[PDB]
Design a protein around this ligand. Structure first.
Ligand SMILES: CC(C)[C@H](Nc1ncnc2c1OCCO2)c1ccc2c(c1)S(=O)(=O)CCC2
Length: 166
């Protein structure tokens, strides 16, 4: 967990303008959070990038999880191997508001982070999921009590988040 260049926002929330895959390789954290869907199909965005860095080992393992346990619920999670990126990968399903899923579930999604002392994570539901990224950061700051290091790849978004937070 050798996080470097983070800006401390609150006692337990840190933020950096960085690619989460590159951070995972440099830091080798205990837990890396994946912005997953309920079937753990990592076809793009953060999920696709993390899977591509494991050379599809995350996807094989995810398919085996789904075969045995069935899909996750929106707001839920599961802990799987982190392969070469981390000791564990916490797959968390935020609501896809662009498809009508309730924004209240974003609090339930962030609540999963509380079972891990330290995590490297993306902003949940801020992708193709269509949630307002600044609102997602507010839910994170209000819900997460353990230590979370957020990697936000876009410098324009990072600057807006830091300006909003101050
Ligand atoms: C907002 C965006 C800049 C950010 N992208 C990344 N943030 C950090 N690391 C990355 C990023 O994408 C390339 C790999 O590394 C982001 C954050 C959350 C979500 C997505 C994207 S999504 O994949 O569109 C859907 C799931 C939720």
């Amino acid at each position: 967990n050798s996080f470097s260049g983070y800006l401390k926002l609150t006692d337990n929330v840190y933020i950096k303008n960085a690619d989460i895959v590159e951070e995972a390789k440099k830091v080798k954290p205990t837990v890396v959070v994946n912005a997953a869907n309920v079937y753990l199909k990592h076809g793009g965005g953060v999920a696709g990038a993390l899977n591509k860095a494991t050379n599809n080992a995350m996807q094989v393992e995810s398919d085996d999880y789904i075969a045995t346990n069935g899909p996750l619920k929106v707001g839920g999670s599961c802990v799987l191997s982190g392969h070469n990126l981390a000791k564990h990968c916490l797959h968390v399903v935020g609501p896809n508001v662009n498809k009508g899923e309730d924004i209240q579930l974003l609090k339930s999604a962030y609540e999963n982070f509380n079972q891990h002392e330290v995590l490297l994570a993306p902003l949940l539901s801020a992708g193709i999921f269509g949630a307002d990224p600044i609102h997602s950061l507010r839910v994170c700051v209000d819900t997460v009590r353990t230590n979370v290091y957020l990697a936000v790849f876009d410098k324009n978004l990072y600057d807006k988040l830091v300006s909003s937070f101050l």
